[PDB]
Amino acid sequence: IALNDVMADMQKASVSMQMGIQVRNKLVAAYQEVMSMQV
Amino acid sequence: STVSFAGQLHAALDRISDRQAAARVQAEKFTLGEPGIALNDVMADMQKASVSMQMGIQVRNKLVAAYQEVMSMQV
Amino acid sequence: SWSLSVQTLVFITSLTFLPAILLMMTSFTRIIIVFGLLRNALGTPSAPPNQVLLGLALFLTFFIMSPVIDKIYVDAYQPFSEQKISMQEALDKGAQPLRAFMLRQTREADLALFARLANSGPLQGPEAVPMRILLPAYVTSELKTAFQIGFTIFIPFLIIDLVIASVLMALGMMMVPPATIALPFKLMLFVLVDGWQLLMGSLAQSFYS
Amino acid sequence: DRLDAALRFQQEALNLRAQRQEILAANIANADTPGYQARDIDFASELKKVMVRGREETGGVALTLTSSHHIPAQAVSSPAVDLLYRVPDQPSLDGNTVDMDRERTQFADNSLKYQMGLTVLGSQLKGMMNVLQ
Amino acid sequence: QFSEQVNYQRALEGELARTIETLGPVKSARVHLAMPKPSLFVREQKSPSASVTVTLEPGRALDEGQISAVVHLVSSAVAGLPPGNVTLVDQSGHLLTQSNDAQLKFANDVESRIQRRIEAILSPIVGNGNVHAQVTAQLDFANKEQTEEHYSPNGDASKATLRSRQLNISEQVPRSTQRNETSNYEVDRTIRHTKMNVGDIERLSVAVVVNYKLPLTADQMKQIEDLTREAMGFSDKRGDTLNVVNSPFS
Amino acid sequence: QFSEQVNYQRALEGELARTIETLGPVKSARVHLAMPKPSLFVREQKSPSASVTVTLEPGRALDEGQISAVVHLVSSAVAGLPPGNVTLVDQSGHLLTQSNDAQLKFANDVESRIQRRIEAILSPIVGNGNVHAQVTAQLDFANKEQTEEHYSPNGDASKATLRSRQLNISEQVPRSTQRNETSNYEVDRTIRHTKMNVGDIERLSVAVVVNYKLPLTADQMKQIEDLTREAMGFSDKRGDTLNVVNSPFS
Amino acid sequence: NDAQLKFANDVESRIQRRIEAILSPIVGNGNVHAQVTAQLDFANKEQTEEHYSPNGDASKATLRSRQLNISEQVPRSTQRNETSNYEVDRTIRHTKMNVGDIERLSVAVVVNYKLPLTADQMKQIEDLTREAMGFSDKRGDTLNVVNSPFS
């Protein structure tokens, strides 16, 4: 496999995993903010 | 059967180590005076081994960064 | 083998995995959960988590694992140092003690679940369970044991709440806030009974039975 | 996806630069063989072809993937780029049309543009990582 | 809450009793259950059980048919209970569950089947009591597994089946020649997974004695010998043995 | 809130009892269900079961059709109850459920079938009682799995199928020539997954005895031999064996 | 389990009654007796056949793409670069062979006398019962019809 291909793959996967984790963080934070109110 | 990507990392580390060991033993043999082995061949193989080792180091750095990031999602 | 090649890359990443996995795979989850629940009782926290409960749990888990750490050292580090073992049999030589310790602590039904969902076949003996099965079973069992301990610890302090609230209502002290009155009584409940020594001792004893 | 559709162009361009790079180093390595007929490729047309069509590398076959211990081996593979002949100046009695100065200025240019592509991908990926933190 | 399930028990073994006394030669039925736990996870394990005691007809006992009746009744009554567990005891001892001799009964049964068949096929020729036979059968009680993975030989390209073939031919004419041939094949296959049957006959040894009418004739004896060879299902590949003699009885 | 299910069962038991009562040869049907439990300990969920004690009409006995009838009543009445687990017991024992040795009952079934067929076909030839035959049958009780994956041979390009082909052909004229050819095929493919049936006949051995009318003629004997060959379903490739003889009876 | 034998009975009985009913007008109500043995296949058979069609004959092939280069110099050097990608005709069956099918029959027929029957009167019986028993000579189906006095 091409070396530049390997590093581009590295970085693309890293960015995708970062984006997924950040989205989950936002959703979990929203869930907890909804669950921490008064009723 | 299975890939077990920890096995893939083990295979990558074994490849890197074997390549460096081959370059080291070739330098061994050449400086020892063993006929055959050429100087440009020694230097070229040492160069390739160095590049593979930096390959491993960069993969290390990015895996450690990835793990340090997946351990930051709140649950 | 490896030749100061990938070694010292695997070593440094091993150090990276040290804090999380190796303190969430051995002990220090049960103790820390019990301390957290104990602080849930006794009213307010008033014990500096980032320093004192964490430090006490870390010292207590070190004292608990001194035998396991000693066996791992004697059968891995002394041989892994320069002769006849190097990061190939080092792993299993250091894993057998930790496996034995983890197996001695697992609830016998978690292994069942994780073997039944990993699609693995029947397991002949105690040893037959692998790491891929042993870890989730151990953490689940540790959670179960920690909460059994922690709720048994709550029960007396809620007894104190019950008695004080009922006495205040019996006297007709209409809406005196029984939590404020209960808090000092919970504190002497926890100090007259020699609380911290008994708790640490019970955890250490329970953690090898 | 839509991560590898925006970074696709620079990735393809940089891979094509590497491919032209070993073409030019094959020119350099065969500097003094007789009858070599130096080769080269057109980068713009080939890049447009790669974007429209894909990779579609022509010629290459690996062995099969049976149970372990069956000695993997591979055939001789070559990218689908159509090698073009470089128009020679100064005939040289042995057919070798590799002019050091042309090949070498092209080598330096290709190296510089490969580095430029690396810089562009690095910038785009750093931008992505800066959004997400 | 500890009584509800125990009440269920001491209700249901009692009601199993009041079923069992409705069996004819059952006078008193006292039964017990056992469900230790379904949890022992290394390669081994352990199972639950149940035990039974019975009082019989005054002067009459139960044969193994009655034993099987009560055994399966109880086993399929209470869940989680294979019939291998249930213990059966007379109102005076006499274990009716050996819990590895059922194979003896099975062998006796097979011998009886074939022996009665021989006698039936030879009674018309010789008469009711002019002939006697007894059989000894060797039985396979070993668990057999098998997984055969036959394939077909594609050494021949006339019947070989290729998926890919890369072929380079290059030669000059001082004739320098070169040839490369990389081939990936698709292979026929058969997977016979098998579980040979337990309790099958593997060797028969049949002995026959026939009475006189005065001795029998050579044809008269060879044909009886042929018929018994036929009726025992004689297959030579098993090494089965057949012996016949004529001699006046008592 | 636990006695509701036990009451449900102790009501449904009498329910099924009474249903069995309205059947003729039933005077008491005391019954037992077993819906075991939702096992979180082992991932197969062994199925429920049921046993029945039936008191027949005095002097009336159930042909096995009635046994199947009651098995199906009990099985289909209880939710998710496989009929294999239904057990029947008489008023005097004698399992109507055979659930290791049913193989031999099955063997006698097949042998009796062939025997009756032979007798029925050959009686008109020689009379009602001048003929006898006995059948010893070999049965294959091993469970057979199989998967054949036939591929057709594409050795001949005149009948092969191509998905891709790259072909380089060159020649200089002292001639220097070259040829490169890559090919990816697509293969005709047949995938049988045959689960062979259990209890199948593998070898019959038939012995036939006929009385005299004085012996039978050669043609009259041979045609009866052909007839019994036909009626035994003689498949020689199975190794079936047949022997017929004529001799006076008692 | 044993229901297989009952099913075999039912099939063979229907065949038996068919021969009896078809030959009774010929010879009489009770002048013919027949027994039939049925060989059943109680095996579960499924199949996945994937006939492709041969596109070797390029006059009948179907190309999606084709890269064809032709070069030559005139001491002649010719080169022919030819790369083709195909689309292929294809059939994909899925037969799930039925369970409980008949694979071989054995029919034995006995006929009474009027004096034995004449040759043509018996060959007609032979062929008629052959017809009535669903005779498939591929299946190895076997027929055996004989004449004799009854009892």
Next chain:
Amino acid sequence: QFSEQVNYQRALEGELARTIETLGPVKSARVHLAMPKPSLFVREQKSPSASVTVTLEPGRALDEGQISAVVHLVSSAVAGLPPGNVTLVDQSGHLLTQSNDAQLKFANDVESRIQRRIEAILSPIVGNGNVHAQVTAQLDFANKEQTEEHYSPNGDASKATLRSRQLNISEQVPRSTQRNETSNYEVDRTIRHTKMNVGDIERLSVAVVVNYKLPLTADQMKQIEDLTREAMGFSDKRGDTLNVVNSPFS
């Protein structure tokens, strides 16, 4: 708060009882549904079931038609109950449902149709009873699938279809000539997706016998044979067979 769903089930039980009873040859019918459970562990979600105990009118028996009628009544009354599993039993065994053999009845029906047709045609010729026929039908019961993707060959440029064409032509004049060409087509495509019907006639065997009027003439017989070929739907490609004979009846 558990006995209410139970009470619904047992009330609907009596409901179906009263309905299925008001049917002529019924004096009682105790029914029992079986809703298995919304289980805890799997996805298969075992199907529900039913069981019926019907007590016939004395001296009256059931055709298949009333069996199908009551099976359909039961299945259609219960929401989400498959008709196949609905077990149906008389007051003395006789599982009149088929809870694998419906093939035989269906084959008999096709044969009955064709035999009635052939009799109806030949009747005006020879009379009411001067002809007979029996038909043996081979039926295909295998589940059939097929998916064909026929293409139109675009080998000919006079009928091919181009989406794009690259065409580079060069030549020198010592003459060097070069011609490169790239082609992409759009290909005609036909996709059949068939599920062949299960229950199709694959081979008819038709045997016909006709009375004597005295023998029938040659034409008088060949025309009868052609009419038989006509009415049986005789197609040779199915391998159908036909045979007709004439002779005295008895």
Next chain:
Amino acid sequence: NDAQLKFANDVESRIQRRIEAILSPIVGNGNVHAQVTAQLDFANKEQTEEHYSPNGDASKATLRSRQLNISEQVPRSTQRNETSNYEVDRTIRHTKMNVGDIERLSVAVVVNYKLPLTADQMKQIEDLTREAMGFSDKRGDTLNVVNSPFS
């Protein structure tokens, strides 16, 4: 632990009763006595075998892949590399031998007199008892018959 003894006793009784039941019609009600000794294998055996087939002969090998290179120049310089990935016919068994299988018989039979039995008549008797014991030579089975007046 002891159950093995009772089991072997029952097996011995079965064999010897069969012997007596065969030989009583020959010689009389009580003129024959046999004692059967059985050795039983109560040792648990386990096994797993996986024969392979020999594919040394290329005409019966099965090739998953094969790369073959052929070169030569003519000072004749040749070279021939062939990497060949095989596919292997395989057969695997898993026996679990029955515990309590008969392994050896030693059986002595005594017969009363009528006067000593004739040699042929006695040889028939011994062949009958050999038959009835299921005598298998490979098991090392042993048989011994004598004739003498009883007491």
Next chain:
Amino acid sequence: MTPESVMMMGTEAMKVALALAAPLLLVALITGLIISILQAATQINEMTLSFIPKIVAVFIAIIVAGPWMLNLLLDYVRTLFSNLPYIIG
């Protein structure tokens, strides 16, 4: 740890609570009941006339009971924390 044991410890908790709070509730009930019996018979009453008697009653109750209820609670809690390692299994 079986459901039998968790119910046992729960009931043990309820009975230690009963023992610890029984004297106080008891003396409050007795004092209120006496003041209400005397409340009539000169039925004069404003709202309570009873709270201060209840306070003096529970004061005497805490003093006289005092050490033994504290000792009972201490025994219970020490026994619970000492059997903590064994209630796991």
Next chain:
Amino acid sequence: TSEQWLYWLHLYFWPLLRVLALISTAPILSERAIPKRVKLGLGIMITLVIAPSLPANDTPLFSIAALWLAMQQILIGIALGFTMQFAFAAVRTAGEFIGLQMGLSFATFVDPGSHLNMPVLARIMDMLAMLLFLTFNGHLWLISLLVDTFHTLPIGSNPVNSNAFMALARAGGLIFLNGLMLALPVITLLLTLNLALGLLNRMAPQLSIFVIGFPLTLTVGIMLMAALMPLIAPFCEHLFSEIFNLLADIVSEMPINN
């Protein structure tokens, strides 16, 4: 280790997301005492055991058009863990109302910012039910049902059907029903006591439940709930099993309804 893996590392993400949703929502799993790292690692270290034999292939689109896939997994987790909270709410109701009988909550009657009764009796029975849950197979059946959801509703374009969130909405529902069905004997007996001591007011209006009633009712309640503590152990069985069945039902309702 390349995207030849690092997009096959897209095999872990969705099952990890679902397991993490369940852990963050489940009764025992999501207790604030557990350090967050333990819960996360348990999610990762369960999915690593379950991820093989899960044939999953999707794409974390930039500006995710497949976030509606992520939603799906989160939702299913919310289905499994949160519903199992109903079983606790029930007792957290029942015991609470028991206090509302004796004397403990007249502060919550006529008016405030302090409730003070949640600490008293609801947390007795709720942690008693906590232990009753754990002691089985408490901790585990939720995880096994999550794996079953992986096998019945793996990954799809039709993740969730309507008419199926009413099941969980009007499910509890059985919160009130079961809280009552547990606290009914205690409530009825203390109703008898309250009405009896009220009938005492007919002999003398001076008897002043504030003076007579509350000390009597407190002892009656404490003693009686001590006597009726074991009744919870069978009830919790019900209290969990039925809710599991509901989850099981919906988990097995969804595939044949898709």
